[PDB]
PDB file of C-alpha atoms and ligand atoms in Angstrom:
ATOM      1  CA  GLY A   1     113.946 117.641 129.657  1.00  0.00           C
ATOM      2  CA  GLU A   2     110.407 116.638 128.212  1.00  0.00           C
ATOM      3  CA  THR A   3     109.053 113.206 130.242  1.00  0.00           C
ATOM      4  CA  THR A   4     105.320 113.398 128.911  1.00  0.00           C
ATOM      5  CA  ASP A   5     103.625 110.029 128.306  1.00  0.00           C
ATOM      6  CA  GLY A   6     103.294 110.416 123.574  1.00  0.00           C
ATOM      7  CA  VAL A   7     104.553 109.933 120.486  1.00  0.00           C
ATOM      8  CA  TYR A   8     107.754 111.377 119.882  1.00  0.00           C
ATOM      9  CA  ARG A   9     109.738 111.926 116.873  1.00  0.00           C
ATOM     10  CA  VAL A  10     113.500 110.948 116.926  1.00  0.00           C
ATOM     11  CA  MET A  11     115.525 113.463 114.511  1.00  0.00           C
ATOM     12  CA  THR A  12     119.170 114.446 113.753  1.00  0.00           C
ATOM     13  CA  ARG A  13     120.835 117.415 112.617  1.00  0.00           C
ATOM     14  CA  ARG A  14     124.178 114.936 111.472  1.00  0.00           C
ATOM     15  CA  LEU A  15     122.882 115.016 107.569  1.00  0.00           C
ATOM     16  CA  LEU A  16     121.412 117.660 105.544  1.00  0.00           C
ATOM     17  CA  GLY A  17     118.741 120.218 107.533  1.00  0.00           C
ATOM     18  CA  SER A  18     117.262 117.933 110.398  1.00  0.00           C
ATOM     19  CA  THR A  19     116.351 114.791 109.284  1.00  0.00           C
ATOM     20  CA  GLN A  20     113.610 112.470 110.785  1.00  0.00           C
ATOM     21  CA  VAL A  21     115.363 108.799 111.308  1.00  0.00           C
ATOM     22  CA  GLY A  22     112.498 107.425 113.224  1.00  0.00           C
ATOM     23  CA  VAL A  23     109.792 107.977 115.802  1.00  0.00           C
ATOM     24  CA  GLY A  24     109.463 106.204 119.809  1.00  0.00           C
ATOM     25  CA  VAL A  25     106.954 106.105 122.639  1.00  0.00           C
ATOM     26  CA  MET A  26     107.008 107.784 126.231  1.00  0.00           C
ATOM     27  CA  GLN A  27     105.697 105.588 128.450  1.00  0.00           C
ATOM     28  CA  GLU A  28     106.151 105.745 132.099  1.00  0.00           C
ATOM     29  CA  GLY A  29     108.906 108.028 132.065  1.00  0.00           C
ATOM     30  CA  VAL A  30     110.622 105.561 129.571  1.00  0.00           C
ATOM     31  CA  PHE A  31     111.373 106.056 125.852  1.00  0.00           C
ATOM     32  CA  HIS A  32     111.103 103.296 123.908  1.00  0.00           C
ATOM     33  CA  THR A  33     111.899 102.382 119.793  1.00  0.00           C
ATOM     34  CA  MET A  34     113.588 100.431 117.755  1.00  0.00           C
ATOM     35  CA  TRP A  35     117.156  99.555 118.174  1.00  0.00           C
ATOM     36  CA  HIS A  36     117.711 100.556 114.146  1.00  0.00           C
ATOM     37  CA  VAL A  37     116.781 103.689 114.568  1.00  0.00           C
ATOM     38  CA  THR A  38     119.191 105.090 116.899  1.00  0.00           C
ATOM     39  CA  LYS A  39     121.604 101.911 116.990  1.00  0.00           C
ATOM     40  CA  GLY A  40     121.585 102.427 120.711  1.00  0.00           C
ATOM     41  CA  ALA A  41     123.020 105.941 121.003  1.00  0.00           C
ATOM     42  CA  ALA A  42     122.135 108.580 123.293  1.00  0.00           C
ATOM     43  CA  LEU A  43     118.959 111.008 122.849  1.00  0.00           C
ATOM     44  CA  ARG A  44     118.175 114.636 123.654  1.00  0.00           C
ATOM     45  CA  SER A  45     115.295 116.125 124.589  1.00  0.00           C
ATOM     46  CA  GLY A  46     115.808 120.028 125.264  1.00  0.00           C
ATOM     47  CA  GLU A  47     118.608 119.955 127.456  1.00  0.00           C
ATOM     48  CA  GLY A  48     118.136 117.005 129.154  1.00  0.00           C
ATOM     49  CA  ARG A  49     119.544 113.862 127.619  1.00  0.00           C
ATOM     50  CA  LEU A  50     118.031 110.169 127.864  1.00  0.00           C
ATOM     51  CA  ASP A  51     120.824 107.872 128.533  1.00  0.00           C
ATOM     52  CA  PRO A  52     120.041 103.438 126.374  1.00  0.00           C
ATOM     53  CA  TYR A  53     119.482 101.327 129.441  1.00  0.00           C
ATOM     54  CA  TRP A  54     118.036  98.203 127.394  1.00  0.00           C
ATOM     55  CA  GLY A  55     118.403  96.878 123.782  1.00  0.00           C
ATOM     56  CA  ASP A  56     118.448  94.058 121.549  1.00  0.00           C
ATOM     57  CA  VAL A  57     119.418  94.020 117.873  1.00  0.00           C
ATOM     58  CA  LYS A  58     117.846  90.777 117.364  1.00  0.00           C
ATOM     59  CA  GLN A  59     114.521  91.972 118.853  1.00  0.00           C
ATOM     60  CA  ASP A  60     115.061  95.481 117.070  1.00  0.00           C
ATOM     61  CA  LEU A  61     113.968  97.684 120.310  1.00  0.00           C
ATOM     62  CA  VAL A  62     115.656  99.400 122.655  1.00  0.00           C
ATOM     63  CA  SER A  63     114.077 101.518 126.080  1.00  0.00           C
ATOM     64  CA  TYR A  64     115.862 104.710 127.711  1.00  0.00           C
ATOM     65  CA  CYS A  65     116.151 105.713 131.484  1.00  0.00           C
ATOM     66  CA  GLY A  66     114.278 102.595 132.346  1.00  0.00           C
ATOM     67  CA  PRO A  67     113.049  98.703 131.383  1.00  0.00           C
ATOM     68  CA  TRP A  68     110.499  98.273 128.880  1.00  0.00           C
ATOM     69  CA  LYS A  69     107.421  99.234 129.710  1.00  0.00           C
ATOM     70  CA  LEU A  70     104.773  97.923 126.868  1.00  0.00           C
ATOM     71  CA  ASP A  71     103.368  94.718 127.872  1.00  0.00           C
ATOM     72  CA  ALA A  72     100.176  94.591 126.100  1.00  0.00           C
ATOM     73  CA  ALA A  73      99.597  92.085 122.990  1.00  0.00           C
ATOM     74  CA  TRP A  74      96.989  91.710 119.393  1.00  0.00           C
ATOM     75  CA  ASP A  75      94.476  89.387 120.801  1.00  0.00           C
ATOM     76  CA  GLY A  76      95.092  87.823 117.273  1.00  0.00           C
ATOM     77  CA  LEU A  77      91.368  88.840 115.791  1.00  0.00           C
ATOM     78  CA  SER A  78      90.424  92.234 116.066  1.00  0.00           C
ATOM     79  CA  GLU A  79      91.395  95.546 114.434  1.00  0.00           C
ATOM     80  CA  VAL A  80      94.426  97.488 114.984  1.00  0.00           C
ATOM     81  CA  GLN A  81      95.659 101.341 114.703  1.00  0.00           C
ATOM     82  CA  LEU A  82      98.862 102.198 113.484  1.00  0.00           C
ATOM     83  CA  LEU A  83      99.649 105.965 115.131  1.00  0.00           C
ATOM     84  CA  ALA A  84     101.932 106.926 111.744  1.00  0.00           C
ATOM     85  CA  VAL A  85     103.821 109.681 112.509  1.00  0.00           C
ATOM     86  CA  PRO A  86     105.663 109.931 108.916  1.00  0.00           C
ATOM     87  CA  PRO A  87     108.864 112.815 108.035  1.00  0.00           C
ATOM     88  CA  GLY A  88     107.610 116.344 107.691  1.00  0.00           C
ATOM     89  CA  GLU A  89     103.778 115.516 108.030  1.00  0.00           C
ATOM     90  CA  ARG A  90     101.494 115.146 111.180  1.00  0.00           C
ATOM     91  CA  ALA A  91     100.591 112.413 113.305  1.00  0.00           C
ATOM     92  CA  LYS A  92      97.839 109.962 111.823  1.00  0.00           C
ATOM     93  CA  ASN A  93      95.763 107.082 112.946  1.00  0.00           C
ATOM     94  CA  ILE A  94      95.186 104.251 110.353  1.00  0.00           C
ATOM     95  CA  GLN A  95      93.298 101.223 111.041  1.00  0.00           C
ATOM     96  CA  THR A  96      93.690  97.833 109.746  1.00  0.00           C
ATOM     97  CA  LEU A  97      93.669  93.789 110.227  1.00  0.00           C
ATOM     98  CA  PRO A  98      97.004  92.882 110.816  1.00  0.00           C
ATOM     99  CA  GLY A  99      97.464  89.941 109.020  1.00  0.00           C
ATOM    100  CA  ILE A 100     101.165  86.301 110.186  1.00  0.00           C
ATOM    101  CA  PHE A 101     104.227  86.479 110.652  1.00  0.00           C
ATOM    102  CA  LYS A 102     104.541  82.508 110.618  1.00  0.00           C
ATOM    103  CA  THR A 103     108.240  81.483 112.101  1.00  0.00           C
ATOM    104  CA  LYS A 104     110.359  78.797 113.576  1.00  0.00           C
ATOM    105  CA  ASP A 105     109.412  80.043 117.281  1.00  0.00           C
ATOM    106  CA  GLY A 106     105.415  81.162 116.319  1.00  0.00           C
ATOM    107  CA  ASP A 107     103.065  83.744 114.921  1.00  0.00           C
ATOM    108  CA  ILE A 108     103.442  87.622 115.141  1.00  0.00           C
ATOM    109  CA  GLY A 109     101.261  89.807 113.936  1.00  0.00           C
ATOM    110  CA  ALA A 110     102.062  91.601 111.012  1.00  0.00           C
ATOM    111  CA  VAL A 111     100.564  95.253 109.415  1.00  0.00           C
ATOM    112  CA  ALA A 112     100.652  95.989 105.759  1.00  0.00           C
ATOM    113  CA  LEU A 113     101.296  99.652 105.767  1.00  0.00           C
ATOM    114  CA  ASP A 114     103.169 101.717 103.366  1.00  0.00           C
ATOM    115  CA  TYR A 115     105.139 104.259 105.021  1.00  0.00           C
ATOM    116  CA  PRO A 116     108.980 105.534 104.520  1.00  0.00           C
ATOM    117  CA  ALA A 117     112.030 104.173 106.758  1.00  0.00           C
ATOM    118  CA  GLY A 118     111.499 107.453 108.998  1.00  0.00           C
ATOM    119  CA  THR A 119     108.229 105.929 110.236  1.00  0.00           C
ATOM    120  CA  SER A 120     110.191 102.924 112.187  1.00  0.00           C
ATOM    121  CA  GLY A 121     109.205 103.531 115.447  1.00  0.00           C
ATOM    122  CA  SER A 122     105.597 104.420 115.380  1.00  0.00           C
ATOM    123  CA  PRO A 123     103.397 102.943 118.094  1.00  0.00           C
ATOM    124  CA  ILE A 124     100.520  99.704 116.560  1.00  0.00           C
ATOM    125  CA  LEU A 125      97.104 100.031 119.396  1.00  0.00           C
ATOM    126  CA  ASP A 126      94.485  98.266 120.487  1.00  0.00           C
ATOM    127  CA  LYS A 127      90.587  98.704 120.766  1.00  0.00           C
ATOM    128  CA  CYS A 128      91.644 100.495 125.002  1.00  0.00           C
ATOM    129  CA  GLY A 129      94.348 103.189 123.294  1.00  0.00           C
ATOM    130  CA  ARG A 130      97.541 100.671 124.733  1.00  0.00           C
ATOM    131  CA  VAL A 131     100.995 100.003 122.742  1.00  0.00           C
ATOM    132  CA  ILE A 132     100.813  96.113 121.649  1.00  0.00           C
ATOM    133  CA  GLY A 133     104.372  96.857 119.368  1.00  0.00           C
ATOM    134  CA  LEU A 134     106.218  99.310 116.915  1.00  0.00           C
ATOM    135  CA  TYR A 135     106.173  99.661 113.311  1.00  0.00           C
ATOM    136  CA  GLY A 136     109.413  99.270 111.415  1.00  0.00           C
ATOM    137  CA  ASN A 137     111.067  95.576 111.157  1.00  0.00           C
ATOM    138  CA  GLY A 138     109.995  93.543 108.551  1.00  0.00           C
ATOM    139  CA  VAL A 139     109.539  91.981 105.302  1.00  0.00           C
ATOM    140  CA  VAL A 140     109.702  93.423 101.288  1.00  0.00           C
ATOM    141  CA  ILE A 141     107.220  91.547  99.170  1.00  0.00           C
ATOM    142  CA  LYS A 142     107.129  90.780  95.431  1.00  0.00           C
ATOM    143  CA  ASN A 143     105.283  93.918  94.942  1.00  0.00           C
ATOM    144  CA  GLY A 144     108.279  96.522  96.269  1.00  0.00           C
ATOM    145  CA  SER A 145     105.931  97.472  99.525  1.00  0.00           C
ATOM    146  CA  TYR A 146     106.267  96.640 102.741  1.00  0.00           C
ATOM    147  CA  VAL A 147     105.347  94.389 105.788  1.00  0.00           C
ATOM    148  CA  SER A 148     105.941  94.752 109.033  1.00  0.00           C
ATOM    149  CA  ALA A 149     106.026  92.698 112.399  1.00  0.00           C
ATOM    150  CA  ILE A 150     104.019  93.872 115.177  1.00  0.00           C
ATOM    151  CA  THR A 151     106.599  94.092 117.826  1.00  0.00           C
ATOM    152  CA  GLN A 152     106.567  93.700 121.194  1.00  0.00           C
ATOM    153  CA  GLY A 153     109.033  93.896 124.318  1.00  0.00           C
ATOM    154  CA  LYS A 154     109.434  91.520 127.105  1.00  0.00           C
ATOM    155  CA  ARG A 155     107.971  93.564 130.554  1.00  0.00           C
ATOM    156  CA  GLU A 156     109.483  92.578 134.145  1.00  0.00           C
TER     157      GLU A 156
ATOM    158  CA  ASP B   1     123.548 114.040 118.114  1.00  0.00           C
ATOM    159  CA  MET B   2     119.653 113.080 118.455  1.00  0.00           C
ATOM    160  CA  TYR B   3     116.919 114.525 119.465  1.00  0.00           C
ATOM    161  CA  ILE B   4     113.217 113.982 120.241  1.00  0.00           C
ATOM    162  CA  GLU B   5     110.302 116.289 119.826  1.00  0.00           C
ATOM    163  CA  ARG B   6     106.733 115.401 120.964  1.00  0.00           C
ATOM    164  CA  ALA B   7     104.321 114.207 118.102  1.00  0.00           C
ATOM    165  CA  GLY B   8     100.613 114.019 119.841  1.00  0.00           C
ATOM    166  CA  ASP B   9      99.146 111.736 122.549  1.00  0.00           C
ATOM    167  CA  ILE B  10      98.544 107.666 122.366  1.00  0.00           C
ATOM    168  CA  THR B  11      94.667 107.263 121.413  1.00  0.00           C
ATOM    169  CA  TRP B  12      92.360 105.050 119.339  1.00  0.00           C
ATOM    170  CA  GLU B  13      90.647 107.426 117.569  1.00  0.00           C
ATOM    171  CA  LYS B  14      86.927 106.353 116.173  1.00  0.00           C
ATOM    172  CA  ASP B  15      86.026 106.725 112.281  1.00  0.00           C
ATOM    173  CA  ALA B  16      90.261 107.006 111.452  1.00  0.00           C
ATOM    174  CA  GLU B  17      91.068 105.497 107.453  1.00  0.00           C
ATOM    175  CA  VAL B  18      90.727 101.668 107.168  1.00  0.00           C
ATOM    176  CA  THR B  19      92.606 100.379 104.841  1.00  0.00           C
ATOM    177  CA  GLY B  20      95.644  97.392 104.043  1.00  0.00           C
ATOM    178  CA  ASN B  21      95.734  93.662 103.744  1.00  0.00           C
ATOM    179  CA  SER B  22      96.218  91.168 106.338  1.00  0.00           C
ATOM    180  CA  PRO B  23      98.805  88.830 104.563  1.00  0.00           C
ATOM    181  CA  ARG B  24      99.526  85.210 105.735  1.00  0.00           C
ATOM    182  CA  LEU B  25     103.572  85.360 105.287  1.00  0.00           C
ATOM    183  CA  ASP B  26     106.154  82.219 106.305  1.00  0.00           C
ATOM    184  CA  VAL B  27     109.798  84.227 107.535  1.00  0.00           C
ATOM    185  CA  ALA B  28     112.458  83.795 109.121  1.00  0.00           C
ATOM    186  CA  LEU B  29     114.254  86.091 111.775  1.00  0.00           C
ATOM    187  CA  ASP B  30     118.169  86.373 111.614  1.00  0.00           C
ATOM    188  CA  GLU B  31     120.869  87.065 114.611  1.00  0.00           C
ATOM    189  CA  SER B  32     120.636  90.834 113.220  1.00  0.00           C
ATOM    190  CA  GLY B  33     117.098  91.191 113.456  1.00  0.00           C
ATOM    191  CA  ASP B  34     116.619  91.057 110.169  1.00  0.00           C
ATOM    192  CA  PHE B  35     113.231  89.249 108.548  1.00  0.00           C
ATOM    193  CA  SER B  36     113.171  87.188 105.183  1.00  0.00           C
ATOM    194  CA  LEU B  37     111.216  85.663 103.116  1.00  0.00           C
ATOM    195  CA  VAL B  38     110.820  81.670 103.436  1.00  0.00           C
ATOM    196  CA  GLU B  39     109.801  79.811  99.831  1.00  0.00           C
TER     197      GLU B  39
HETATM  198  O1  LIG C   1     115.310  98.816 106.307  1.00  0.00           O
HETATM  199  C1  LIG C   1     114.035  99.349 107.733  1.00  0.00           C
HETATM  200  N1  LIG C   1     114.117  98.691 108.417  1.00  0.00           N
HETATM  201  C2  LIG C   1     115.037  98.120 109.236  1.00  0.00           C
HETATM  202  C3  LIG C   1     116.609  98.534 108.893  1.00  0.00           C
HETATM  203  C4  LIG C   1     117.585  97.414 109.634  1.00  0.00           C
HETATM  204  C5  LIG C   1     117.334  96.740 110.841  1.00  0.00           C
HETATM  205  C6  LIG C   1     115.933  96.502 110.896  1.00  0.00           C
HETATM  206  C7  LIG C   1     114.733  97.486 110.160  1.00  0.00           C
HETATM  207  C8  LIG C   1     116.402  95.293 111.964  1.00  0.00           C
HETATM  208  N2  LIG C   1     117.773  94.596 112.093  1.00  0.00           N
HETATM  209  C9  LIG C   1     118.330  96.090 110.870  1.00  0.00           C
HETATM  210  C10 LIG C   1     113.357 100.043 106.787  1.00  0.00           C
HETATM  211  C11 LIG C   1     112.505  99.613 105.561  1.00  0.00           C
HETATM  212  C12 LIG C   1     111.383  99.837 104.748  1.00  0.00           C
HETATM  213  C13 LIG C   1     110.962 100.567 105.917  1.00  0.00           C
HETATM  214  S1  LIG C   1     108.347 101.122 105.753  1.00  0.00           S
HETATM  215  N3  LIG C   1     108.796 101.716 107.676  1.00  0.00           N
HETATM  216  C14 LIG C   1     109.591 101.425 108.384  1.00  0.00           C
HETATM  217  C15 LIG C   1     110.886 100.568 107.220  1.00  0.00           C
HETATM  218  C16 LIG C   1     111.756 100.483 107.815  1.00  0.00           C
END
């Protein structure tokens, strides 16, 4: 069906009406999203079908039609934009400076913007418009707010 | 059955709404891909 590069909404008709479960990125004929959005299930794009190709529950990432294509990374210094696609609302760029998730296996960038869980899969961008990661996997802080990591896959 | 709908282009927007803080947090990632706070 629609294979054009860009940001897409991931929807379902299983619940009441049409519900937005997440968001994803189409790039180089590959659909990239977060694992918790689709659970590895097949996707529909008009009359066409997207079958999963690669996935990992720990990284919380999944690619459809081909291997993960997104290889840009946050430089640890400059501001980024969350191209947020919220349920029932238009795509919107939100500029912020990322924080840090300090882990036993290294540091990761983190965006502190509050959006519904259906916004999961929204791409985080660098100044050149390159996707440096996906929004939707993080932690809940002392004030109920969500702080997501900048989750990036590995390009082979 | 899940489906996809195009929502726009992937572009950087100059003069976008600039908001949000930059916190430094101690986290742990489990086998299920869930993050948790370490103190
Ligand atoms: O529940 C959420 N995320 C999630 C669910 C299940 C799993 C994982 C993450 C990773 N391991 C499995 C959540 C909560 C709040 C917000 S706000 N914007 C995105 C967002 C995602």
